[PDB]
Design a protein around this ligand. Structure first.
Ligand SMILES: COc1cc2[nH]nc(-c3cnn(C)c3)c2cc1C(=O)Nc1c(C)cccc1C
Ligand SMILES: [Cl-]
Ligand SMILES: [Mg+2]
Length: 282
């Protein structure tokens, strides 16, 4: 047990399930005194844990994620590590709670409600995810599955990227070709990442272009009507998704630049932050 990060299990009261994926179950919890200012204050957290049927491999993957989160360090636009329970029973990894839930569901709830998102709100969403990715790229972190389902929204509308710390071993091609949480992850993958079986910051920038298209369609599912067995041949032939309705030329330019066939011709995350900042300023 690393004493910097260890929390007593007695400080943690597990609450309701928040969701489940290929990489673990996430449950809501109250953690007492995880805020150093007030060692008796309850703070709501999310706890990542293994499913009951988990293997030793699954455990090593969750441990690898926890250790990777420690190495990467804190940023406003990522789901930060807050602590762990590593001795005395099942591995619990405590991470930030995001009260408005995932970005894809947030956008879909705002197609036809009173909480209509403005253009500026949507550009702010994209800007914040670009800032979190710029940070991750500066720490040599490659996400490998950037998508709006993998971004969380706090009570203050801060965007936080989740599941950036996963091992490459869990991002086998079986993960990308099976449905999880209402999506087929291969539809966010850069063509060369599929073909060469290696991921880079440039393949993450491709996935960011798909995320940007998700934002401006208010949570659309990518490549509407195209069979997944036909997609990558169409991408090689130069097929790209059309401009979302009401999207400006500036934002669609950014999407199209993210999807350049040559990885070296894509913007970096640093450039994307500047480009999205320019849109906010104008
Ligand atoms: C680390 O992951 C999370 C951290 C979280 N912090 N707070 C919340 C949360 C959600 N709803 N409210 C109210 C608070 C939250 C959810 C996740 C999450 O949904 N994980 C996930 C799953 C389960 C499946 C597929 C993909 C992913 C990224
Ligand atoms: Cl999909
Ligand atoms: Mg440019």
């Amino acid at each position: 047990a690393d004493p910097k990060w260890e929390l007593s299990r007695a400080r943690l009261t597990l609450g309701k399930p928040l969701g489940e994926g290929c990489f673990g179950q996430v449950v809501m919890a109250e953690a007492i005194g995880i805020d150093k200012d007030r060692a008796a204050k309850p703070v709501t957290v999310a706890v990542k844990m293994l499913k009951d049927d988990a293997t030793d491999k699954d455990l090593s993957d969750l441990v690898s994620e926890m250790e990777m989160m420690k190495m990467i360090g804190k940023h406003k636009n990522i789901i930060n590590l807050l602590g762990a329970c590593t001795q005395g029973g099942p591995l619990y990894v405590l991470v930030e709670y995001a009260a408005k839930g995932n970005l894809r569901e947030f956008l879909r709830a705002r197609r036809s409600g009173e909480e209509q998102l403005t253009f500026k709100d949507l550009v702010s969403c994209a800007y914040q995810v670009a800032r979190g990715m710029e940070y991750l790229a500066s720490q040599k972190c490659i996400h490998r599955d950037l998508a709006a389902r993998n971004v969380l929204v706090t009570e203050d509308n801060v965007m936080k990227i989740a599941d950036f710390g996963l091992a490459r071993d869990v991002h086998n091609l079986d993960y990308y070709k099976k449905t999880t949480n209402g999506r087929l992850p291969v539809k966010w993958m850069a063509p060369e990442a599929l073909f060469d079986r290696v991921y880079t910051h440039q393949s993450d920038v491709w996935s960011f272009g798909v995320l940007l298209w998700e934002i401006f369609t208010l949570g659309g599912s990518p490549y509407p009507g195209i069979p997944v067995e036909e997609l990558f041949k169409l991408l090689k032939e130069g097929h790209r998704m059309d401009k979302p309705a009401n999207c400006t030329h500036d934002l669609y330019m950014i999407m199209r630049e993210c999807w350049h066939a040559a990885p070296s011709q894509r913007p970096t995350f640093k450039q994307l932050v500047e480009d999205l900042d320019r849109v906010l300023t104008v």
